Design a protein around this nucleic acid. Sequence first.
RNA 1: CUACCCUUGGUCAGGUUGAAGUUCAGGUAACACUGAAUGGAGGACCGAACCGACUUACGUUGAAAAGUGAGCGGAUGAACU
RNA 2: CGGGUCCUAAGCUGAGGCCGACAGGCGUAGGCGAUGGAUAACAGGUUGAUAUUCCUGUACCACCUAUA
RNA 3: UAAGGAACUCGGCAAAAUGACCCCGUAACUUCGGGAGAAGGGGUGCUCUUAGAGCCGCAGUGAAUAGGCCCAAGCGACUGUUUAUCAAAAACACAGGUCUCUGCUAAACCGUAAGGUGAUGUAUAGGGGCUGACGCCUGCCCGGU
RNA 4: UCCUAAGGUAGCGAAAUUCCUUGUCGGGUAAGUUCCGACCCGCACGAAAGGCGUAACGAUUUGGGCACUGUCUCAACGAGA
RNA 5: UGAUAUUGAAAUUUUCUAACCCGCACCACUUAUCGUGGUGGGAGACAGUGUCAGGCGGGCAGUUUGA
RNA 6: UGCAUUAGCUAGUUGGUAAGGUAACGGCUUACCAAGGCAACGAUGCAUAGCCGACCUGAGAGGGUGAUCGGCCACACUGGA
RNA 7: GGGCGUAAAGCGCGCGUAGGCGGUUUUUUAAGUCUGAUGUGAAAGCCCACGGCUCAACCGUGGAGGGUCAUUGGAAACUGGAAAACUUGAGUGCAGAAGAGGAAAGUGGAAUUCCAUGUGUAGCGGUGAAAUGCGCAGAGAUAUGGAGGAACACCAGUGGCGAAGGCGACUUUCUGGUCUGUAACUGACGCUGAUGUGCGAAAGCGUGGGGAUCAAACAGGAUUAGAUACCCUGGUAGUCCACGCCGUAAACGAUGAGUGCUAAGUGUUAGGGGGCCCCUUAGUGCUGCAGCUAACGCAUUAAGCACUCCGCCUGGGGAGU
RNA 8: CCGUCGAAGGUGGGACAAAUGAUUGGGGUGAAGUCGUAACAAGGUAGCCGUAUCGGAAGGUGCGGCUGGAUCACCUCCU
RNA 9: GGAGGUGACACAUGAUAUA
RNA 10: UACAA
Length: 88
Amino acid sequence: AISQERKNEIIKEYRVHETDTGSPEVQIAVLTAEINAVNEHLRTHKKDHHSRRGLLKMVGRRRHLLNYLRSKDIQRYRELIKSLGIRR
RNA sequence: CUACCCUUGGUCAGGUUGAAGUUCAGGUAACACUGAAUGGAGGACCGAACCGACUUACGUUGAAAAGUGAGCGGAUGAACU
RNA sequence: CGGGUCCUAAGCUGAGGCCGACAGGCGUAGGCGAUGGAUAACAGGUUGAUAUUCCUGUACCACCUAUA
RNA sequence: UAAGGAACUCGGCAAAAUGACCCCGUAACUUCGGGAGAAGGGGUGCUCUUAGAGCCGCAGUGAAUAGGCCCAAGCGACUGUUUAUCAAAAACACAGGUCUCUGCUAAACCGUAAGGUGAUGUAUAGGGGCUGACGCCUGCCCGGU
RNA sequence: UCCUAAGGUAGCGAAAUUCCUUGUCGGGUAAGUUCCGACCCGCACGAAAGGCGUAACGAUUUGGGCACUGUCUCAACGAGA
RNA sequence: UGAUAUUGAAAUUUUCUAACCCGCACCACUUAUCGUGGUGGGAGACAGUGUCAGGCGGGCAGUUUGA
RNA sequence: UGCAUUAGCUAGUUGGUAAGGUAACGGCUUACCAAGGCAACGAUGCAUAGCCGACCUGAGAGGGUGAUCGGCCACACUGGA
RNA sequence: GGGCGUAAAGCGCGCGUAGGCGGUUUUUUAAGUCUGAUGUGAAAGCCCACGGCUCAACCGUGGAGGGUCAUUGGAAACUGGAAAACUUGAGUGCAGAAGAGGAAAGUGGAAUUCCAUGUGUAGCGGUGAAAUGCGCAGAGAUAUGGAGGAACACCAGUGGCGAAGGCGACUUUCUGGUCUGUAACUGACGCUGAUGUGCGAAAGCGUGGGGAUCAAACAGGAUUAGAUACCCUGGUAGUCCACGCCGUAAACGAUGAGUGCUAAGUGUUAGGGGGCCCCUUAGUGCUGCAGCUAACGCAUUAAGCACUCCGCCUGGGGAGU
RNA sequence: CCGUCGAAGGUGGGACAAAUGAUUGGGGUGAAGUCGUAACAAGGUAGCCGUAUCGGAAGGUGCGGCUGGAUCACCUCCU
RNA sequence: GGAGGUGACACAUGAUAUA
RNA sequence: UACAA
Ligand SMILES: [K+]
Ligand SMILES: [K+]
Ligand SMILES: [K+]
Ligand SMILES: [Mg+2]
Ligand SMILES: [Mg+2]
Ligand SMILES: [Mg+2]
Ligand SMILES: [Mg+2]
Ligand SMILES: [Mg+2]
Ligand SMILES: [Mg+2]
Ligand SMILES: [Mg+2]
Ligand SMILES: [Mg+2]
Ligand SMILES: [Mg+2]
Ligand SMILES: [Mg+2]
Ligand SMILES: [Mg+2]
Ligand SMILES: [Mg+2]
Ligand SMILES: [Mg+2]
Ligand SMILES: [Mg+2]
Ligand SMILES: [Mg+2]
Ligand SMILES: [Mg+2]
Ligand SMILES: [Mg+2]
Ligand SMILES: [Mg+2]
Ligand SMILES: [Mg+2]
Ligand SMILES: [Mg+2]
Ligand SMILES: [Mg+2]
Ligand SMILES: [Mg+2]
Ligand SMILES: [Mg+2]
Ligand SMILES: [Mg+2]
Ligand SMILES: [Mg+2]
Ligand SMILES: [Mg+2]
Ligand SMILES: [Mg+2]
Ligand SMILES: [Mg+2]
Ligand SMILES: [Mg+2]
Ligand SMILES: [Mg+2]
Ligand SMILES: [Mg+2]
Ligand SMILES: [Mg+2]
Ligand SMILES: [Mg+2]
Ligand SMILES: [Mg+2]
Ligand SMILES: [Mg+2]
Ligand SMILES: [Mg+2]
Ligand SMILES: [Mg+2]
Ligand SMILES: [Mg+2]
Ligand SMILES: [Mg+2]
Ligand SMILES: [Mg+2]
Ligand SMILES: [Mg+2]
Ligand SMILES: [Mg+2]
Ligand SMILES: [Mg+2]
Ligand SMILES: [Mg+2]
Ligand SMILES: [Mg+2]
Ligand SMILES: [Mg+2]
Ligand SMILES: [Mg+2]
Ligand SMILES: [Mg+2]
Ligand SMILES: [Mg+2]
Ligand SMILES: [Mg+2]
Ligand SMILES: [Mg+2]
Ligand SMILES: [Mg+2]
Ligand SMILES: [Mg+2]
Ligand SMILES: [Mg+2]
Ligand SMILES: [Mg+2]
Ligand SMILES: [Mg+2]
Ligand SMILES: [Mg+2]
């Protein structure tokens, strides 16, 4: 869905420190771009159920990371919520 | 006159109902979906004008060679003129 | 003022033209044809009988002639 | 108009009853729109205070005008149309269905023809036959015509 | 068994079709040749001269009930032409 | 539907063009979706039309359908 | 205690203020204000049932019963004071 | 104090909410847990002891028992609450690799059917045997060309991919997942999953296209005592496409998911490390111990040994009514 | 004496529940009367599952699936 | 040798218990 | 064998 160049752009922007690729903020931001791209694919490929199943897993993984971030530090969580186009 | 049509005009008191859309709100990953408001559709509803003629009474050397009285059907439409 | 001296609709008619025993039928250009388009005046007074028409006051339109 | 209340009659024909506005409340069935004004019930006068307190009559939309309602069955889906002048209907039409003809100077129709309609349209179009919303469906026979 | 091209599927049925006939049974009535629901013995239903149903609609046809009444028992009085 | 006339030219049904036809395009008459001519294109001795013939023909007509 | 083949219930309802009322607190009652309160941890509705010490059974864990004796409640032909 | 491969019993399969459950360590707390104190758990009853009834029933007296009870003082291992660390679980990054995973649009070869043309003549077709059927108006056969729909030989393999249903010509575009290595990173972020929400062979349904082959129904021909069949000749829906619906199958491994542990041998698929072999991951098969099983059998892909969560069963018929 | 609240009663339309109703549907049991012979063997067309359709009936046929299918082949695997 | 994949005319019927 | 037909 997204290139390694676009992924590295997102990692650079949302990392909480240098050499960070595994924080919730980095993962949620990358998952958000991937979810948006597959939604773009599914708008002209409505019958692609198999791809849509993979999108549903990304949405579930993002929601779990968001729940963990919210319960650990709500300040980091609410700043990430506005940065992306995410409600809750 | 009447039937149908052509061209060009005109007319339809007031009430009632509340379609599609839209917006806001919930809701979603994105749609579906839902409520409120808005909106004003319909050979839609009730009912004058108007157009009819279902029932009944009267009239039947008529007021009238087809009518009158009382109700009755349609009444933004395939309307009436 | 309404109509004509303006415009076209349906329709009618139709120089030439096409068709048809005859008589005639159709039709092109064009023409006629309002129920539509265009278009300059109002208020008051007056008679037995007319009135945006007569009369009074105040206008507007088209055309003509002269100064411009 | 006593008492009765459809016993009248082919048939409740005619008449009586209902009726306005405001507020409650409303069934089977349903194509989810409806059915529905379903049904069934409450309130209306006048005066005073700012919803209460009073006043009067037999009666308060005090006159006139203003849906009767319910249950079930046949037919037709529906609005519409018809025998001017004894029939308005279950008849006609209808949206929908199907069959069939028609390649365009189309087929079909009027006309002797010319000229036209079809159509200033072109098979998602035009003419003709039958059926008649919608739902579920539409079996057998091609010997004869 | 005979014959045919083939001998009526689903659904419906005393029906706007049933002659016998007021068929028979049930419901409704005190009493119902009409009505409703069933049966099938369909004189002589039957699938686009469509079959079976169907919410909504009807001055349609048919049966029942409430309200209501001079329709009636059974007529009487009054107003006017 | 056939013959024949309009109706010709070559092969063996095919070909051709020149009669006939075009509710085919452009041009002129001409401010004209008529018409008439001109040029292209299509079609073509077919079609259309005349005469003759056979067939179908309640679409329409005249009649009959006894005592 | 059953039943989800019972999922929505409530509008004095839930809270507040004031007054009234009671032996007493209290929506207990009324007036005004606000829109709360309950529920899948089963609200609500329907059905069933007086509850307990005890009693019967069982190795026990459990299952079954509430006559007699004792505690508590409710009722006194039905309903309202 | 039971089960769910074949006896009744694993939802067809995902995603996921509530809930249940949850890796290592330190500090802290004290709800659960443990341990005393106090109060209370009436009397009668039951049980033990003793006394009175001639005995016994029975009666009486003294004890014991019965709470998930409350209040209060201690303990701190485990469960829970708070705080702080951790990297093994789970994710991310980086480096490789394989794949009929999915959606869309294009290109191609064989064959079937139909159509035309040329040659060419008497049958072709079909069965157990036949007949229906097609054919002298030229079939069938043969050669060439065209139209059209459908499906993709060989490759092809207890091979591969996918949650399952499923996925097989080739090309491009869009896109999902998995595996191996590394140890940058985050630091338990996990597992399961009622309700829910989605996907789901074939048949079937709606609208509209398409229509080669095959083929319910149906017709004819056979067979047969009959033949509403099996066989033959045809043939409609359907089979194909798009968009909706339906939500079911012996949807099967008749075996729910997760995690760990427990002999070996031997094929195969995709990788990695080291010297064709040895080691090692992850799949996919066969054989086979321990163990399990009623037996059959299963056996590191468990039906073994364990913990967590879900679904389901409780004799047969009636009745999945 | 007047008004608000007030049981019972009456009026109305619905909700629910139990009884019964011409006729009607399927089931169980009893007996084997009748018609066939569908399954069990390759049960004489392998059977079963879903679905569709047809038929006196068991059942047939189509499409997909399963082996919980007999007999004989050609291959992978194991011993 | 044993498995797993692959492929490959007609024949109706026979009551109840007790066996 | 006792039955059934
Ligand atoms: K007019
Ligand atoms: K037509
Ligand atoms: K014929
Ligand atoms: Mg007027
Ligand atoms: Mg109307
Ligand atoms: Mg009206
Ligand atoms: Mg009229
Ligand atoms: Mg009148
Ligand atoms: Mg009306
Ligand atoms: Mg003329
Ligand atoms: Mg005058
Ligand atoms: Mg009277
Ligand atoms: Mg009276
Ligand atoms: Mg009365
Ligand atoms: Mg009478
Ligand atoms: Mg009488
Ligand atoms: Mg009347
Ligand atoms: Mg009124
Ligand atoms: Mg009608
Ligand atoms: Mg009408
Ligand atoms: Mg008349
Ligand atoms: Mg009349
Ligand atoms: Mg008709
Ligand atoms: Mg014939
Ligand atoms: Mg008769
Ligand atoms: Mg008929
Ligand atoms: Mg027919
Ligand atoms: Mg017919
Ligand atoms: Mg009809
Ligand atoms: Mg009346
Ligand atoms: Mg008089
Ligand atoms: Mg005649
Ligand atoms: Mg004559
Ligand atoms: Mg005579
Ligand atoms: Mg009781
Ligand atoms: Mg026991
Ligand atoms: Mg057991
Ligand atoms: Mg299990
Ligand atoms: Mg079994
Ligand atoms: Mg089983
Ligand atoms: Mg399973
Ligand atoms: Mg299943
Ligand atoms: Mg004693
Ligand atoms: Mg990579
Ligand atoms: Mg991979
Ligand atoms: Mg899970
Ligand atoms: Mg579930
Ligand atoms: Mg299908
Ligand atoms: Mg066949
Ligand atoms: Mg289809
Ligand atoms: Mg589809
Ligand atoms: Mg199962
Ligand atoms: Mg397991
Ligand atoms: Mg395990
Ligand atoms: Mg083994
Ligand atoms: Mg292995
Ligand atoms: Mg058999
Ligand atoms: Mg068999
Ligand atoms: Mg069959
Ligand atoms: Mg399968």
